[PDB]
Amino acid sequence: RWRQTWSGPGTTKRFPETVLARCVKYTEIHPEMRHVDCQSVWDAFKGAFISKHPCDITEEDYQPLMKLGTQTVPCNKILLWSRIKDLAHQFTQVQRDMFTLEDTLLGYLADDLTWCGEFDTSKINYQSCPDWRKDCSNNPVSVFWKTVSRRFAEAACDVVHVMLDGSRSKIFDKDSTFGSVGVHNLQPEKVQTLEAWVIHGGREDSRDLCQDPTIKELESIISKRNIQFSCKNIYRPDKFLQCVKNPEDSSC
Ligand SMILES: NC(=O)c1ccc[n+]([C@@H]2O[C@H](COP(=O)(O)O)[C@@H](O)[C@H]2O)c1
Numbered sequence: 001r002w003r004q005t006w007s008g009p010g011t012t013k014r015f016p017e018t019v020l021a022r023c024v025k026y027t028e029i030h031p032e033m034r035h036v037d038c039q040s041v042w043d044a045f046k047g048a049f050i051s052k053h054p055c056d057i058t059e060e061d062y063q064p065l066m067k068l069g070t071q072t073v074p075c076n077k078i079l080l081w082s083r084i085k086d087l088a089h090q091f092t093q094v095q096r097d098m099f100t101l102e103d104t105l106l107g108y109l110a111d112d113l114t115w116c117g118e119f120d121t122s123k124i125n126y127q128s129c130p131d132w133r134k135d136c137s138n139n140p141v142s143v144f145w146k147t148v149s150r151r152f153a154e155a156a157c158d159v160v161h162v163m164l165d166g167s168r169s170k171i172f173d174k175d176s177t178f179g180s181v182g183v184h185n186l187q188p189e190k191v192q193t194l195e196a197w198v199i200h201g202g203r204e205d206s207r208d209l210c211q212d213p214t215i216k217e218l219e220s221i222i223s224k225r226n227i228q229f230s231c232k233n234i235y236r237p238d239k240f241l242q243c244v245k246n247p248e249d250s251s252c
Pocket residue numbers: 079080081082083084100101102107110111112113145149175176177178179182
């Protein structure tokens with residue numbers, strides 16, 4: 001067929017087997033998650049979206065999965081990000097101290113995957129899935145990330161860090177998961193400071209992007225929640241990672 005139902009790419013091929021193997025791999029590696037039955041995790045993940053209209057997904061749909069994926073993360077070591085995925089993960093892979101959402105069981109299971117079902121059947125739809133923008137925002141993928149990003153934001157305390165892509169015209173974007181979910185779910189009783197790291201798009205020799213209008217916006221929103229705002233430019237992300245791997249020595 002030359003026309004699919006939805007505008008988004010369909011479910012990642014071998015979704016069941018991929019999620020299940022990711023669950024095995026994660027629970028083998030991370031000792032705190034050793035009790036976790038992966039078949040049950042798969043069962044609950046399925047239950048959230050199978051036989052349900054892929055434009056009528058709710059956070060409740062994912063609560064059984066959230067229960068099984070209950071995980072304590074060091075609340076003062078949380079790294080959020082927006083758009084600038086790869087440096088965030090490369091950073092935490094060396095700084096095995098800070099944690100992104102994808103360093104948790106639930107984020108690790110879903111990272112870069114797409115999935116949806118159909119109301120009329122228990123079939124997984126490998127042909128197409130709702131686009132958040134063209135089709136509906138209550139779809140299995142978008143609702144999953146909203147639910148898990150909210151809980152992750154709520155667990156943070158002390159200094160929370162966020163990496164932003166400073167080569168976007170909207171370095172801070174009110175419409176990203178970070179801007180719509182993360183910023184509004186940090187708990188002012190616990191979170192002392194949000195510190196933004198503005199990742200430069202290379203170039204070299206460049207602007208203080210902590211003065212960018214959208215950063216002033218972020219600063220204002222955060223300050224009015226009674227949380228301190230801090231910002232740092234990361235001019236050379238290639239040198240940053242190098243300094244993380246080899247603190248001091250040369251030009252760090
Ligand atoms: N790894 C993914 O596939 C994925 C997708 C959307 C959101 N997220 C989470 O939400 C935030 C980033 O999303 P935005 O780029 O919409 O701000 C991060 O905290 C991230 O962990 C992850």
